[PDB]
Design a protein around this ligand. Structure first.
Ligand code: A1IRF
Ligand code: A1IRF
Ligand code: A1IRF
Ligand code: MG
Lengths: 221, 216
């Protein structure tokens, strides 16, 4: 099950391909300053509107960082310094449902040679089972994600799909230990879904719903 | 604020803002692990000043954004330091590379203040507007950076007038307050030459579709 998590523990992270902390030293109007950040990849996200079903296509999956943040919210001190060899078991753990998010289809810009659009198409295939062409995609927005702690860009795309385009199993790469659920969000429930704070979601979902309902859906009515 | 000199990359062993951790867990019986950063939650505030019919935003130098732009222009600029000290960026970029436009915002890192009160504090110190917690509408709560941080961000909206602009703002001792007229708002958001956040883009889009049509 996606939401069945066991043995949850926190440990030190000495090196990682996904985050690499650095400090920028610089003078700003003659004052010497420093700033802590982490080097990270850019990313792409893609909102699909399935017109056969009149539903938006989203993904649901366990996010370990979200789970840890939620354990820390409900049990302050869970993420205390790991001053020991090896991980420290959480006491108490939360249910794994605490880390399950709803997101747009998304992936890192870590694919040598692929365009941003092609990365978006790859993720829509691998995560959702939808076959897209790059020219099917509309660029919605490009922006900085997390300006305080990283300098990564994210680019969001949009495309309309039909049922015939859902020709794959989706669910992410099985061999690589991914378990992703495809969510089809009926348009009639979409704004309520986004506004509901009991469903953990990203700003990309909330913005995607708002943007679609005000910029696209009227030109289909 | 855009006059940045002698930029250099050094190591970051400890920081009160990012602490690298690894979650270890079993899912479907398989042992997994995930690298992330422990970080603070945050709040953002969109203000509509109806005296001026303008959205209140902030502009400031963001070092991480700057570093990201140097790495884009000169790959390898951010390689591991491997020295006794920081390594100068040569070539570098002008400070304008790191200048962003954002919503008023702050970390939830201080005991004593609710989310609403952090937002009022930031609106005062950054924008010079005096707000009350009860003046705030919660627009959205969401997770930013679910891959590496898991921290939560709450966005508030509130309506102000010039009668509430009782301070200068600009931060504490370089933040500039931006007043975006409603008529140019959408064009501002769409302008890809303006370095801005998803919070700004969503704030302008939300305001123009949920508030602006019912004004007046
Ligand atoms: C709406 N429809 C949907 C699909 C239809 N379509 N699109 C492609 C097609 C082409 C080129 C790249 C592509 O996506 C990637 C391929 C590799 C890596 C990353 C993305 C997809 C295609 C095809 N090869 N054969 C038959 N039909 C096709 C036309 C419009
Ligand atoms: C004010 N004073 C002077 C500056 C000092 N400060 N603040 C940060 C820092 C951390 C994380 C987010 C961040 O901005 C956001 C805050 C909320 C929402 C979105 C972005 C800023 C920082 C750093 N990473 N490294 C060194 N100093 C740092 C903090 C105290
Ligand atoms: C097989 N896949 C599965 C995961 C595996 N992977 N991916 C990340 C990881 C990093 C940063 C962002 C992220 O997700 C987003 C990507 C785009 C937009 C929004 C979120 C994921 C990661 C980690 N931080 N620690 C350990 N393993 C990790 C390797 C590749
Ligand atoms: Mg993904």
């Amino acid at each position: 099950s996606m939401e069945r998590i066991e043995g949850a523990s926190v440990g030190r992270c000495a090196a990682s391909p996904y985050l690499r902390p650095l400090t920028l030293h610089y003078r700003q109007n003659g004052a010497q300053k420093s700033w802590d950040f982490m080097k990270t990849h850019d990313s792409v996200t893609v909102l699909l509107f399935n017109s056969s079903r009149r539903s938006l296509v989203l993904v649901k999956q366990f996010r370990p960082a979200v789970y840890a943040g939620e354990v820390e919210r409900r049990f302050p001190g869970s993420l205390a310094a790991v001053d020991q060899d090896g991980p420290r078991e959480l006491q108490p753990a939360l249910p794994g449902s605490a880390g399950v998010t709803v997101e747009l289809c998304a992936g890192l810009v870590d694919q040598p040679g692929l365009s941003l659009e092609e990365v978006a198409c790859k993720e829509a295939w691998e995560e959702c089972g939808y076959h897209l062409a790059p020219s099917d995609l509309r660029r919605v927005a490009t922006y900085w994600s997390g300006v305080g702690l990283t300098g990564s860009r994210q680019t969001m795309f949009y495309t309309e799909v039909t049922d015939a385009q859902r020709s794959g199993p989706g669910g992410g790469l099985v061999e690589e230990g991914e378990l992703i659920e495809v969510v089809h969000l009926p348009l009639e429930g979409a704004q309520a879904f986004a506004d509901d704070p009991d469903i953990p979601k990203t700003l990309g979902v909330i913005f995607g719903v708002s943007w679609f309902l005000s910029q696209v859906a009227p030109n289909l009515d």
